[PDB]
Motif scaffolding. Structure first.
Motif, PDB file in Angstrom:
ATOM      1  N   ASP A  58      -0.046   8.162   0.353  1.00 25.12           N
ATOM      2  CA  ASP A  58      -0.347   8.682   1.617  1.00 25.12           C
ATOM      3  C   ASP A  58       0.621   8.640   2.684  1.00 25.12           C
ATOM      4  OD1 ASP A  58      -2.631   8.927   0.127  1.00 25.12           O
ATOM      5  OD2 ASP A  58      -3.776   7.200   1.609  1.00 25.12           O
ATOM      6  N   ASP A  81      -3.145   3.607  11.316  1.00 30.77           N
ATOM      7  CA  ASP A  81      -2.428   2.044  10.785  1.00 30.77           C
ATOM      8  C   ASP A  81      -1.866   0.610  11.468  1.00 30.77           C
ATOM      9  OD1 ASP A  81      -2.910   0.377   8.584  1.00 30.77           O
ATOM     10  OD2 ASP A  81      -1.824   1.043   7.292  1.00 30.77           O
ATOM     11  N   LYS A 104      -8.785  11.098   7.254  1.00 30.84           N
ATOM     12  CA  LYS A 104      -9.316  10.620   6.883  1.00 30.84           C
ATOM     13  C   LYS A 104     -10.422   9.351   6.601  1.00 30.84           C
ATOM     14  CE  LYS A 104     -14.067  11.508   3.485  1.00 30.84           C
ATOM     15  NZ  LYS A 104     -14.260  12.940   2.677  1.00 30.84           N
ATOM     16  N   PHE A 105      -9.276   8.624   5.323  1.00 25.63           N
ATOM     17  CA  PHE A 105      -9.945   7.492   4.756  1.00 25.63           C
ATOM     18  C   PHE A 105      -8.395   6.299   6.440  1.00 25.63           C
ATOM     19  CE2 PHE A 105      -9.917  10.547   1.491  1.00 25.63           C
ATOM     20  CZ  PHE A 105     -11.579  10.285   0.752  1.00 25.63           C
ATOM     21  N   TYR A 106      -7.141   6.714   6.917  1.00 30.79           N
ATOM     22  CA  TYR A 106      -6.510   5.673   7.255  1.00 30.79           C
ATOM     23  C   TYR A 106      -6.928   6.229   8.689  1.00 30.79           C
ATOM     24  CZ  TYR A 106      -3.739   3.941   3.574  1.00 30.79           C
ATOM     25  OH  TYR A 106      -3.035   3.818   2.757  1.00 30.79           O
ATOM     26  N   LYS A 148       6.566  14.972   0.427  1.00 29.98           N
ATOM     27  CA  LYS A 148       5.400  14.926  -0.354  1.00 29.98           C
ATOM     28  C   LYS A 148       5.299  13.861  -1.566  1.00 29.98           C
ATOM     29  CE  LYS A 148       3.079  18.400   1.831  1.00 29.98           C
ATOM     30  NZ  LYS A 148       2.440  19.570   1.865  1.00 29.98           N
ATOM     31  N   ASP A 149       4.432  12.759  -1.730  1.00 33.67           N
ATOM     32  CA  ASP A 149       4.634  11.716  -3.168  1.00 33.67           C
ATOM     33  C   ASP A 149       2.560  11.576  -3.565  1.00 33.67           C
ATOM     34  OD1 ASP A 149       3.739  10.399  -1.354  1.00 33.67           O
ATOM     35  OD2 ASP A 149       5.456   8.550  -2.056  1.00 33.67           O
ATOM     36  N   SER A 150       2.743  10.840  -4.024  1.00 37.96           N
ATOM     37  CA  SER A 150       1.253  10.684  -4.874  1.00 37.96           C
ATOM     38  C   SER A 150       0.988   9.318  -3.892  1.00 37.96           C
ATOM     39  CB  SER A 150       1.376  10.103  -6.263  1.00 37.96           C
ATOM     40  OG  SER A 150       2.340   9.265  -6.471  1.00 37.96           O
TER      41      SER A 150
END
Lengths: 309, 311, 311
Positions: C283, C107, C97-99, C279-281
Motif C-alpha cells: 500500500d 498513518d 480508504k483503509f489508512y 507501485k507494488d502489491s
C-alpha cells in the motif's frame, strides 16, 4: 473496467466455481457478522445492567427508590492481512497454448489465469478453514513451523480462559475414561441463562471411530448426545468430524449471545490490482486475505486433549 | 498498554445492546391460560359459577308437572396485585450530541447511556426478575435466594402455591433416583384432575435433576419412565419437560389446562416508563420504570412440587 | 498517558499541512530582473567584446612608422543549467480508504501521507533548498555547510559570485558598529556602478545586524546614516532594507538593475511532479519531483559582501 482489465473480467466470470468454505457448518447463521476492515483491530463494547436492591413498593408517598446500575466491557479483536503470489500465462499469449483438449503447458506447469486463480483460491480457503478451526497457521502435516500471529487472534481450539480436560496416555484407548473427562468438562460448563441453545461437537477421526463402539444395545455417541442434551435444555446436538484435529474433542454452543464470528468482509481470497509483467509470456498475480475475528464468552468452550505420550 | 497510537488501528466499532425479548414464562403456559386484567394495585375478586344435578331426569310421559331440578353454586376468589418501581440514570436528551460520537454511544468512563439503551437494558433485567417471581413466587436478587422482599397475601407462584401436593425426598436419599421416582409416583397418585384429566402436562426440573434423569433406568431412561407414568394419567397426551436454572432441587408438575390453572396478569405487568423525569442543570437525568406482580390462580391439589432436601 | 479511555474526549481533530508559498527570492529582485528561459539541462552562451591599451601613445614628430597598438579581446559568458530530482513515499490512492479516517489523515505511526499532502510538503522543502541556493550559491543539507554537492562551473549565487567586493570585520570589533560601518563605507567606495548608478539598491542583513543598526548614531540612527550613504552613490534613489534569517553576520548590498545583475532561470526551475509512479502489491507508492538550478548572472564590483568574523 472489464473493457480495460481482462484479469478482473476473468475473475468475475470464474468466481462462481469456488466451493464454499466448510467452516460455515461450525456456526449458526446468526453467529456470523461481517465487518469492514483489512488490517488493525475492532473494539467491541458490551453494555449490561444490574439491580442494586429489591424494587420499591409504590404506596403512599416515597422519594427513595431503588436504582438500576450499568456497566461496560471492552473487547479488542485483532485482524491481519496476508498475501500470496502465483505465476500464470499471459492473456495475449494464451492463444499459442490453447490446445484442442486444454490450455497450458504440461511440461512447464503453466496454467491460464482463471484456472490458476481458482486453484489458489481453493487452497487459501482451505488454509483459512484450518486457521479458524485451530487458531494456528501452518502448511505442514506435523503442524510445526507455525506463523507467528498477533495476540487476541484465537481459534476454537486455542481460545484462552476456557475449559480444558486432558486424558492421560495410559487411558488413551479407554472410552470410559474419555467420557468421564467429558462429563467433568460438561459439569464445569457455565452457560448461565443462555443454556437453551443447540450444541456442536467436533471430533477427530480416531475419536469418531471410538464413539461407535458399544457402550460399556447403546452407543457412546448416543450416551454423549444424551449427556449434552441434559445441559442444553434437550435441544439439538450436532456431531462433526474433521481431519484437521488430532485426539481433540471440541464442544461449544451455537448461540450468538455467547460465541460470535465477526470476520472481515475481505477475509476470503481477493485479487490484487498489481500484475507483474515483462517481455516474456509469464506473469505474476497476487491474492489477499484477512485472518482474525473470533469472540467467545469466558468458560463456554470444552476442549479435551487425549495425550498420546 | 501500547506506547504508540493504537487508537489509529481501531477502524471498526461494534456495540452490543441486545433487545427486549419475549419473557420465558410464556413457555410455561398455554395460550388459553393467560388473560390480561385491568388493574395496577389492590385486589380483584373473581367469581366461578357452577352447576350440579339434584336427581335423575324426569320422563315426559302423559301429564306431569313435578320435574327434577338443576342447582347452582358460586365461589369467590380474591387476587392481590402489587406495583413496583425502579430508577435509572441516563444522559439528558440535549447532551447526546456532545456525549455521543460515531464510534461511541455514551460515557464508557462513567457508564452513562442514552435513554433508549438504558431503558432496554433495564426492561430486560426487570423481565428476568418477573420471570423469577412467576416461577418461584419470591422476589430476590441474590443467588442464595435470601433477603426476600415481603409480599402481600394471596400472591403466590407455582412453587409456593398452598393447598397443593408437596413431596419431600430425605437427605439420605438425595442421590437415589429410585426414591425420587417413588415420591413422584405418590404425588401423581395423589393428583386430582377430575374430568379435566385429558390435558397436556408440563414438568420443570433443575439441572441436577435433569442430569439424574438422563441416566439409564434401574435400555430405558428415567425420563422416559416418567413420561410414560405421566401419560398414564393425562390420557396419553403431550408431556413437556423443561429445565430452569432458577430452581434448585425442585420438581414441578402441573397441567396446561385453563380450567385448573390460570394466569390473570395486570395489563401493566411488563415494564412501563413513568412520566416523571428528574432534570437539573447538569447533563445527567433519571427515569422510572413501573411493573405489576401477581395474578396466578390455581385449583386445589392440581400441582405436584417435589423438594429434594440436601441436608 | 492515561489509564482511562482518553480517546473518548477527542471531540474534534485538526491537521496542519501548510500551503505551497511563493519563494522569498522574488523579494530580492525587481520584476524586470528575472526572465525565464526554456532549457531543462544545458548552457546558454553570449559573446562580449573589450578593448585595452598596450603602451603609451606615440608622438608624431618628424618620421616614424613604429606606433603603439590598441588591443582587443573576446569573452564567452556561459550559464549552466542542471536538472535534479527527489523521490518521496506516500500512500497508494486505493488504500486511503483503509489508512485514513475522519480523525486521521494518514498513518501517524509510520509517517505515511496521501499524495497531495506529501507532494505539498516536499515542494515546500525543495523551494526552501532553491532559495538557499539562490542566496548562498551552494547546495547542502548540513548546518556546517560541508558535504556540498559538486556543481557545474558558472553556477554561482549572490554570496559566492566571484570578483565582487568583500569586506571582513575582525572578531574583536564585532560589537563596534563604527568599525562595521567603516568597512561598509570602504566597500561602497570600492563599488563601481558605471553609468547605471541611478538605480534602486537592495540591502539584506541578519537580525543581529538589524538590532545593531537600530541603535542611535555616535536624533539620527545608524540605519538612516547607511541609507543616506547608499543614496549618495545611487543618486538618491530608493534603498530597500530586508532582514533574512538565512544570512549570519553577513551584509549584502547590490543594485536592483537588470543591466548589472540579471536572473534567467529555467522555466522548469520550480518543483514539478514526474509521470513515473512506483507501485507494488503493498500500500506504499513512490513519486518523483524535478527541479532545475542555475541562471544567475552579475557584473563585477557590483555586489558588496560584509562578513563579521566571530573568531
Amino acid at each position: 473496467l472489464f473493457d480495460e482489465n481482462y484479469y478482473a473480467k476473468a475473475v468475475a466470470n470464474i468466481i462462481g466455481e469456488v466451493k464454499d468454505p466448510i467452516m460455515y457448518k461450525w456456526f449458526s447463521p446468526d453467529q456470523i457478522e461481517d465487518v469492514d476492515l483489512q488490517m488493525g483491530y475492532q473494539k467491541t463494547v458490551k453494555w449490561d445492567a444490574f439491580l442494586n436492591a429489591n424494587p420499591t413498593t409504590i404506596a403512599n408517598e416515597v422519594n427513595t427508590i431503588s436504582t438500576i446500575g450499568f456497566s461496560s466491557e471492552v473487547v479488542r479483536l485483532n485482524y491481519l492481512k496476508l498475501q500470496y503470489k502465483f505465476r500464470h500465462l499471459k492473456q495475449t499469449s494464451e492463444k499459442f497454448y490453447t490446445s484442442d483438449s486444454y490450455i497450458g503447458d504440461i511440461n512447464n506447469n503453466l496454467l491460464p489465469f482463471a484456472q490458476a486463480y481458482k486453484l489458489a483460491s481453493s487452497e487459501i480457503i482451505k488454509l483459512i478453514n484450518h486457521f479458524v478451526l485451530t487458531g494456528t497457521v501452518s502448511i505442514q502435516k506435523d503442524g510445526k513451523n507455525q506463523k507467528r500471529l498477533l495476540p487476541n487472534m484465537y481459534g476454537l481450539l486455542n481460545m484462552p480462559e476456557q475449559i480444558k480436560e486432558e486424558v492421560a496416555s495410559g487411558d488413551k484407548d479407554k472410552m470410559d475414561k474419555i467420557f468421564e473427562k467429558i462429563e467433568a468438562g460438561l459439569s464445569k460448563l457455565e452457560l448461565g441463562d443462555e443454556f437453551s441453545t443447540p450444541m456442536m461437537v467436533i471430533v477427530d477421526p480416531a475419536t469418531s471411530l471410538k464413539l461407535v463402539k458399544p457402550y460399556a444395545c447403546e452407543k457412546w455417541e448416543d450416551v454423549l448426545i444424551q449427556t449434552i442434551k441434559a445441559i442444553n435444555n434437550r435441544e439439538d446436538v450436532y456431531i462433526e468430524t474433521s481431519n484437521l484435529l488430532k485426539h481433540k474433542i471440541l464442544i461449544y454452543p451455537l448461540n450468538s449471545e455467547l460465541i460470535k464470528f465477526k470476520p472481515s468482509k475481505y477475509m476470503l481470497p481477493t485479487p490484487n490490482e498489481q500484475v507483474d509483467k515483462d517481455s516474456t509470456d509469464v506473469a505474476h498475480s497476487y491474492i489477499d486475505f484477512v485472518l482474525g475475528g473470533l469472540l467467545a464468552t469466558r468458560k463456554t468452550i470444552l476442549q479435551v486433549n487425549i495425550k498420546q505420550s
